[PDB]
């Protein structure tokens, strides 16, 4: 997955999330065209594959011909009542895309973090199964403690949790941020 | 601190060169869609492990004149010959030609550009054709991905051909060139999207997928269509509206998380002390757990009836019912959240 966010001078916007699924997709590159082919079929459920201990397959997401597999992607645009864009946001990184996008929104809209902080702020993830909360290395350890005393099992992410690109409207114009976790920076005028 | 504020326009992509390419498209009079496409073509090079013309995408697009949002669905589809029991292991579903779904990326760019383009199609490719030929230093993200998959890359000559220097994966800062893809981008620029789906690239695409054990056919490519969704999912959040894609993407999950949480009236005060902050983050995690319980009912709405599921996932009342089951002093076992498969 990769996410990018765009706001043009007339106020129109695009939030786009694109993917070949796992890193380097199917690992099939064409020696002639250079195209690297997706492994999106992996995002279907299959009766014969168990991915997580004790978790059954999901029939709603089985393979049929012509069907699209479920995706964690969620490119979002938030628009104010006056018709102006407020936020353009989305994320990359697998199952943690949806939670990371939620967090970036919560951080900016409710906690009052500016867009760069909303992007850089430590994240956490829980998807019910596995039955664990993953937290990034630099999260406030008072949060880790508050989770653990409420009987969450926490574990620290070996690398990082998701990648967020975002733009927010401010009094000064359009504030943009790309996520240091993957190394991007925005551009504008 | 690393802030970036722009008086007129902005592109936030995951590589600076691609953000610059999008920004230049805007400055040259392109629409937001033109800029997005130009930047996407570049990200497919600079973060080639992540996305590209061999994959698929969704675009959420807002027109500030009409004040309408739309979604373009260009996610890959299972080939015509696919079937429910085609894989017996995760490895089979993840590696090789059989793991490949029909790419939607280029027909997604085409539809978006037909509806919202200002710059010529070929102009969108030009910067990336140069970049692919000139080469670029491998960035942080691609470098870590190469390291992560070093074994599979180094053992596959067709991958090592571009992603290695002297038989070992490229490291951060080392130059990556993508000369074959540059020529493919040039062909797409000149001949259009039709080249991919029903033109000069098509037979070779099929040959490549089938040679690696896949089942995509020319008919699959010819028949692929990106879809316009005139009524994306939305939720109200205060005085704002949030537009996001429904199933088969995760808009319904995001909607449910946010609708659960909005009833707590979070503010800066929610994170002002360890006590408040701890409860706040617990509530967030519990909202995630409830939302993921419901996610297992989702699938492609052309094939599965998710109407009522999505209705609930986007309903404030349903969210309030779940919020009421969040305990401030404890989390719960899996069954508490009522995960559902049927
Ligand atoms: C998995 O097993 C089924 C049932 O025999 C078979 O139809 C299918 O071809 C198998 N898949 C692979 C990749 O071997
Ligand atoms: C936005 O909507 C207006 C009004 O219908 C239309 O003229 C214009 O072409 C649209 N812009 C884009 C970039 O699609
Ligand atoms: C193009 O499409 C037509 C029908 O849609 C088909 O007869 C023809 O073989 C296709 N050509 C390629 C190169 O796919
Ligand atoms: C949000 O909910 C549905 C989307 O289909 C629709 O009835 C309503 O008009 C939408 N609101 C906006 C502002 O688009
Ligand atoms: C929607 O939620 C209600 C509770 O508010 C529940 O009774 C109903 O079964 C749900 N619908 C589906 C399809 O799960
Ligand atoms: C999951 O974690 C919770 C929290 O400690 C615990 O109560 C439960 O027993 C665990 N296992 C399952 C299957 O829910
Ligand atoms: N390709 C990973 C997804 O769509 O979620
Ligand atoms: Cl990204
Ligand atoms: Cl190449
Ligand atoms: Na920034």
């Amino acid at each position: 997955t990769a996410h990018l966010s765009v706001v043009a001078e007339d106020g129109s916007a695009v939030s786009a999330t694109s993917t070949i699924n796992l890193y380097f997709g199917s690992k099939v590159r064409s020696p002639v065209s250079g195209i690297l082919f997706n492994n999106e079929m992996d995002d279907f459920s299959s009766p014969s594959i168990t991915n997580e201990f004790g978790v059954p397959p999901s029939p709603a997401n089985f393979i049929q011909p012509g069907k699209q597999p479920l995706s964690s992607m969620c490119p979002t645009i938030m628009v104010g009542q006056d018709g102006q864009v407020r936020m353009v946001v989305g994320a990359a990184g697998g199952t943690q895309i949806t939670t990371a996008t939620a967090l970036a929104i919560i951080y900016n809209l409710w906690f009052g973090y500016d867009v760069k902080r909303a992007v850089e702020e430590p994240r956490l993830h829980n998807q019910l199964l596995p039955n664990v909360t993953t937290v990034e290395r630099n999260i406030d350890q008072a949060v880790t403690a508050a989770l653990e005393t409420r009987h969450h099992h926490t574990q620290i992410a070996s690398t990082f949790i998701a990648v967020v690109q975002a733009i927010v409207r401010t009094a000064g114009g359009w504030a943009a941020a790309s996520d240091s976790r993957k190394g991007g920076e925005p551009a504008g005028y | 601190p690393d802030n970036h504020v722009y008086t007129r326009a902005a592109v936030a992509a995951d590589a600076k060169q691609c953000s610059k390419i999008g920004r230049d498209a805007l400055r040259d009079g392109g629409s937001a869609v033109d800029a997005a496409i130009a930047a996407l073509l570049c990200v497919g090079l600079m973060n080639a492990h992540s996305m590209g013309i061999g994959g698929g995408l969704f675009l959420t697009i807002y027109n500030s004149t009409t004040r309408k949002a739309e979604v373009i669905n260009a996610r890959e589809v299972a080939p015509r010959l696919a079937f429910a029991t085609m894989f017996n292991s995760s490895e089979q579903s993840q590696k090789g030609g059989l793991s490949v779904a029909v790419p939607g990326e280029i027909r997604g760019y085409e539809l978006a550009h037909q509806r919202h383009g200002r710059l010529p199609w070929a102009r969108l490719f030009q910067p990336s054709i140069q970049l692919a030929r000139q080469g670029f230093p491998v960035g942080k993200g691609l470098a870590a991905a190469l390291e992560n998959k070093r074994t599979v890359i180094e053992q596959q000559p067709v991958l090592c051909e571009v992603f290695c220097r002297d038989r070992k994966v490229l490291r951060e800062g080392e130059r990556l060139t993508l000369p074959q893809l540059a020529d493919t981008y040039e062909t797409l620029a000149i001949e259009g999207a039709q080249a991919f789906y029903n033109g000069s690239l098509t037979a070779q695409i099929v040959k490549d997928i089938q040679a690696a054990g896949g089942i995509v056919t020319a008919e699959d490519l010819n028949n692929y269509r990106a879809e316009l969704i005139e009524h994306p999912l939305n939720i109200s959040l205060g005085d704002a509206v949030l537009y996001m894609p429904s199933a088969p993407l995760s808009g319904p999950v995001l909607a449910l998380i946010l609708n659960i949480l909005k009833g707590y009236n979070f503010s800066r005060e929610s994170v002002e002390s360890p006590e408040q902050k701890g409860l706040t983050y617990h509530r967030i995690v519990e909202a995630f757990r409830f939302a993921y319980a419901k996610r297992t009912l989702l699938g492609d709405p052309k094939f599965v009836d998710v109407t009522e599921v999505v209705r609930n996932m986007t309903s404030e009342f349903f969210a309030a019912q779940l919020r009421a089951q969040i305990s401030d002093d404890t989390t719960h076992p899996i069954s508490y959240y009522k995960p559902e498969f049927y």
Side-chain angles (χ1 to χ4, degrees), chain A residues 1-168 170-189, chain B residues 1-166 168-342:
Chain A
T1 42
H3 185 74
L4 60 75
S5 290
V6 179
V7 176
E9 186 169 2
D10 64 12
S12 292
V14 175
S15 198
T17 318
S18 177
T19 193
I20 56 175
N21 193 17
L22 304 186
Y23 286 181
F24 307 97
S26 66
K27 316 305 187 292
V28 179
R29 175 180 173 270
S30 172
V32 171
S33 69
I35 295 165
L36 185 52
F37 293 98
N38 71 86
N39 64 345
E40 220 66 57
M41 297 296 291
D42 164 73
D43 277 357
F44 285 108
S45 197
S46 292
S48 298
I49 304 175
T50 304
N51 301 315
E52 299 154 24
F53 185 96
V55 179
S58 303
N61 192 36
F62 287 166
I63 301 166
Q64 301 305 334
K67 190 173 176 187
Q68 297 180 311
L70 186 68
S71 177
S72 292
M73 298 192 293
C74 52
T76 298
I77 299 174
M78 182 191 298
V79 182
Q81 61 77 20
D82 70 6
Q84 295 186 284
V85 171
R86 287 181 58 170
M87 188 174 204
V88 186
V89 63
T95 46
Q96 309 120 326
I97 290 169
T98 314
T99 55
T101 300
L103 290 168
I105 293 167
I106 291 160
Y107 291 166
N108 181 255
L109 185 66
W110 293 333
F111 297 172
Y113 298 165
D114 67 29
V115 68
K116 183 58 168 175
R117 182 176 185 175
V119 164
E120 293 296 323
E121 181 77 13
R123 293 192 281 259
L124 71 180
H125 179 68
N126 192 305
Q127 56 182 59
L128 186 66
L129 287 159
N131 191 32
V132 66
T133 304
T134 303
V135 298
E136 283 187 306
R137 278 177 270 102
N138 53 340
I139 200 163
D140 181 350
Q141 291 167 107
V143 169
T144 301
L147 296 174
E148 289 276 342
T149 59
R150 292 175 170 85
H151 313 294
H152 298 274
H153 305 101
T154 69
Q155 63 180 21
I156 300 167
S158 56
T159 55
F160 57 84
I161 299 177
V163 183
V164 178
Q165 271 66 241
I167 299 168
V168 168
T170 68
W174 303 105
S178 303
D179 200 322
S180 68
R181 295 159 180 85
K182 191 167 181 170
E185 291 292 3
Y189 62 98
Chain B
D2 180 26
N3 306 315
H4 285 84
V5 185
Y6 309 99
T7 269
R8 295 177 265 178
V11 179
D14 66 15
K16 185 186 184 192
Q17 174 71 271
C18 304
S19 302
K20 291 172 67 171
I21 284 170
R23 184 277 313 287
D24 296 345
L26 292 177
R27 186 189 275 150
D28 292 347
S31 62
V33 163
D34 294 327
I37 295 165
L40 288 159
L41 288 160
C42 172
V43 177
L45 309 177
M46 302 202 87
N47 285 298
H49 62 297
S50 293
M51 64 153 285
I53 59 168
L57 87 161
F58 262 62
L59 305 96
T60 305
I61 305 171
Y62 177 72
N63 187 322
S64 65
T65 295
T66 58
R67 301 186 174 177
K68 288 195 165 189
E70 69 186 38
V71 161
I72 290 178
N73 171 351
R75 178 156 177 85
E76 311 99 302
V77 296
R80 167 183 64 86
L81 295 169
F83 56 101
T85 53
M86 67 194 286
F87 305 125
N88 303 306
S89 72
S90 284
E91 177 71 342
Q92 287 172 358
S93 75
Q94 287 170 11
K95 197 181 188 307
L98 200 65
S99 74
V100 181
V102 182
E105 195 82 7
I106 287 291
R107 251 168 190 166
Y109 298 170
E110 176 178 33
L111 180 54
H113 186 257
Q114 290 174 332
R115 293 178 53 73
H116 309 286
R118 294 294 179 267
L119 295 175
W121 178 256
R123 165 62 180 84
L124 307 182
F125 289 80
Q126 198 291 140
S128 291
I129 294 160
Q130 282 200 28
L131 185 59
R133 286 176 173 157
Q134 190 171 348
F136 49 89
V138 167
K140 173 176 182 187
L142 176 55
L146 287 162
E147 182 61 24
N148 183 263
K149 298 299 183 175
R150 60 183 178 288
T151 299
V152 63
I153 298 278
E154 289 169 354
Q155 70 191 10
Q156 176 53 243
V158 180
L159 286 172
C160 216
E161 220 153 30
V162 291
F163 290 124
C164 292
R165 181 175 88 92
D166 301 326
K168 313 296 286 183
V169 297
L170 292 169
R171 293 176 286 273
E172 189 169 354
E174 293 186 317
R175 184 167 298 272
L176 165 57
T177 54
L178 295 167
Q180 281 73 46
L181 193 57
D183 286 352
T184 299
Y185 278 22
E186 181 148 38
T187 293
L188 290 164
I190 296 163
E191 298 180 12
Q194 193 186 9
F196 191 104
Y197 293 93
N198 184 215
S200 70
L201 304 167
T202 308
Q204 182 69 51
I205 289 165
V206 173
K207 181 178 172 184
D208 291 325
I209 294 170
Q210 292 186 7
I215 58 178
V216 175
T217 64
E219 188 183 358
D220 285 314
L221 288 161
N222 305 159
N223 289 349
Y224 184 87
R225 294 289 185 280
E227 163 191 44
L228 175 66
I229 297 174
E230 293 211 301
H231 306 292
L233 207 64
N234 79 67
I235 61 168
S236 156
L237 226 47
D239 295 348
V241 59
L242 278 72
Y243 293 112
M244 58 195 62
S246 198
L249 264 61
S250 284
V253 183
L254 177 56
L256 184 49
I257 290 168
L258 294 173
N259 275 345
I260 288 173
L261 295 167
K262 77 189 186 188
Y264 290 122
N265 306 127
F266 288 166
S267 67
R268 297 166 194 265
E269 287 182 357
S270 306
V271 296
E272 268 181 8
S273 65
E275 294 90 343
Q276 289 173 286
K277 188 172 187 180
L279 179 51
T280 291
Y281 278 80
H282 167 67
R283 282 161 169 183
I284 291 171
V285 172
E286 291 303 287
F288 293 170
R289 287 166 73 76
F290 267 113
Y292 277 84
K294 308 314 173 188
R295 180 185 195 267
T296 37
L297 291 179
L298 295 175
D300 182 341
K302 294 184 184 306
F303 286 76
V304 176
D305 183 352
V306 297
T307 300
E308 288 300 275
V309 172
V310 170
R311 196 110 69 200
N312 273 355
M313 292 182 77
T314 58
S315 159
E316 298 168 301
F317 182 65
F318 179 79
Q321 292 181 315
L322 302 191
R323 178 170 57 253
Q325 298 174 65
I326 294 177
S327 311
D328 287 340
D329 60 328
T330 190
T331 190
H332 298 280
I334 297 321
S335 66
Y336 181 85
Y337 307 88
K338 291 181 173 67
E340 276 165 51
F341 301 94
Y342 297 93

